[PDB]
Design a binder for this molecule. Structure first.
Ligand code: NI
Ligand code: NI
Ligand code: NI
Ligand code: NI
Ligand code: NI
Ligand code: NI
Lengths: 313, 313, 313
């Protein structure tokens, strides 16, 4: 049985636009918990993490809200490690992607051998020294990679951090807006990725075949899927802060997750960057939330071909 | 030469929403006959079947309008068998999909060896005992399969029925909203299908290769294509009663049909579920009808690469 | 380094709808030059060609504006041949596609061995004798093919013309609206093409593999890409005179060009048929121009996976 641990993380200081901290809210009221139970899922809601208000959090060089970001992630890492010890797949309904730092960190504590699939239009691997915006939702990966420790300076709020994954344990899918420094890091550290160009070339089918074989070839190991809503095309998930045209299809989104589900190795899930305040219409918000909800259910079993219980219909 | 027999079937009691019985009307006024003739097609319009008004048709258990549905289908089966004996491909411009029962039945009478391709977002294989809605447009296949006779009760209006096809003579394409009982029947009877997951995985090209090889491997045999308009994505065919996101692409729709046409074995065609009254705008109606018209022309020869006569241009 | 030569060609008499002669304008103000320089490109703007006003230009049979069309193309051929001798890839920001005649002609002068990739929803290979509209933006290819000289009559304004490419040096991609005579010419001259049916069947990946292998198999040779904006789906490039549904995807558009760029053999580029006056909304115009701009940048290096300089980030 698929046992899940719901972690609400209403946080937004990893990026400038407010409203992403409403994510857990709109997703829950969308009926996410009820829908998960509607399936053969065991679900325990750990609630919305109450995030510390850090008033004195001036920039560190160019990095914005470092103490708020580092604290919220440190708080999440603890809860995630908690649900994992409870033998449940952690489902972090987030705000911005900077939370990936705490999410993946807490996961690795209980499962140091985890492999990561990062669905996103961006690589979010900028360092405090390479970021040009200073927004931490575009730097989470830089704090988690071991190869990169020595290049990430001491940023207030992240002293608790310890790179938990190496360049060979992560695969990107959906890339279409990568900075030059990020690209240099990709090729330099030899990180495996499938940008939109590879998806167009090979097909999402082969893309998934190759990604799983890549991460699970040597052996089976826990999988952490970090799903940034902007990885999908804006025609599907318009209410998000950093949209980029030419994204992953609604179908491709479901394919990716249906395939992950079928491995039986999913142990961590992040559904990030849904910002209801950024929809141009009420339907744009509804369209984003519904899509985010559908991708979530696919991670936990919902199959387009249908499902049925071990009973004689 | 492609000889066609147009059968207008303005029927809607297979489902709750009225307006689908206008289908033949909007399609004809869209210039369907003229366009078919514009090609190298021989076309005979058998007119719109005048459908009996059955006032006393109370539910059978949960099944709605059983006598109206069974009568309209029995009426269609007779006409279809008529055009087939006239050596013409039957083209049933319908209302709801429950008409598939009469359409496929009348077809098999003249060609008992027929194979069926069912393009739809749904499997429409619920039985009177498994249906939760009672709407017969989601049960046509259950009445036609031989393996299932023994599970389909005696429903008023369908005593004339006799399962004409077995589980190994039908292939589904486009599935994305299948009930648990329907899924159980799929896996239990070993029915061949390509849900959206398979289309995403293999590509519509391989999907078609496999479907035709599946049905025509052993030998060439007449093909009956039952095309439910909701099999295509709602961005293409929005004016339909049961839309489901993540559907077949406009291009994929044309690919499927262009491939069927090229076999030279098409003998029966159903273009169902177009409901002009369900469009949110006049353009949504026009968009649905135009797409339905385009898929029809592709079944009878229109090729995207172009066409030309056996003359020196 | 990718050295480019910008040629503005504000011309519209190859088709009935005015406004396409604004193309160079909207593209330049869209920041095209600046964006190209933003990359590792050397860019020289040869300006907007001042096109002769030919008042006395009555139809030739059915052919409209023959002297205006032939003159503007003759003028472009000279400039294109100029930038090519300057060792720069010619980038013709055009109006209508009839300019392809002058563009490809001037290119071949300096590089007679050139191969052509024609991205378009149409084959634009009608002859003055096969065209039913008389609009020259649908006849450019007929004037350029050697095999066809003997069938193209003496049309006022094109005496300067000399077919420069044979049927075996051109590949079409995106076809979905081809006339019967054009189709007859396709099959008769054995021209290589990938209509939307082939793109759906094989995938844009294989399509590109096959196209380049086809044209560059025997040997490496300069490539001329003639990109008609209507080759892409109208949901991407709506502001164009002859749109056709079921077109090339935004992603496929970028894939095609990213692949061409990677050959290192691009020498001529046409970005045609963008008509800002045909957008139903200001955003439809912006959407068309932005897409046309993105396809242009991809031809010159912009990669979705990212880019970086030969420096240590
Ligand atoms: Ni992103
Ligand atoms: Ni992200
Ligand atoms: Ni359906
Ligand atoms: Ni149906
Ligand atoms: Ni065109
Ligand atoms: Ni063209």
């Amino acid at each position: 049985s698929r046992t899940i641990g719901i972690i609400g993380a209403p946080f937004s200081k990893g990026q400038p636009r407010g409203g992403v901290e409403e994510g857990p809210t709109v997703l829950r009221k969308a009926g996410l918990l009820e829908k998960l139970k509607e399936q053969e899922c065991d679900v325990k809601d750990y609630g919305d993490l109450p995030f510390a208000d850090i008033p004195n959090d001036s920039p560190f060089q160019i990095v914005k809200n470092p103490r708020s970001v580092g604290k919220a992630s440190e708080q999440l890492a603890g809860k995630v490690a908690e649900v994992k010890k409870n033998g449940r797949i952690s489902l972090v309904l987030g705000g911005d992607h900077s939370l990936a730092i705490g999410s993946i960190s807490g996961h690795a504590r209980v499962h140091p051998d985890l492999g990561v699939i990062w669905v996103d239009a961006h690589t979010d691997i900028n360092t405090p020294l390479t970021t040009t915006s200073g927004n931490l939702h575009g730097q989470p990966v830089s704090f988690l990679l071991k190869e990169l420790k020595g290049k990430i300076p001491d940023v207030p709020g992240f002293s608790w951090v310890t790179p938990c994954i190496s360049a060979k344990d992560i695969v990107y899918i959906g890339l279409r807006d990568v900075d030059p420094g990020e690209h240099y890091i990709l090729k330099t550290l030899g990180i495996k990725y499938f940008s939109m160009t590879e998806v167009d070339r090979l097909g999402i089918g082969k893309v998934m075949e190759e990604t799983l074989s890549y991460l699970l070839g040597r052996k089976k190991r826990p999988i952490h899927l970090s799903f940034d809503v902007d990885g999908l095309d804006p025609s599907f998930t318009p209410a998000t802060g950093t949209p980029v045209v030419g994204g992953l299809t609604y179908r491709e989104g479901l394919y990716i997750t249906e395939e992950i589900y079928k491995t039986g190795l999913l142990s961590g899930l992040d559904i990030m960057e849904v910002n209801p305040s950024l929809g141009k219409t009420p339907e744009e918000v509804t369209r984003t939330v519904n899509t985010a909800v559908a991708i979530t259910l696919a991670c936990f079993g919902l199959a387009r071909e249908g499902n049925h219980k071990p009973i004689d219909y």
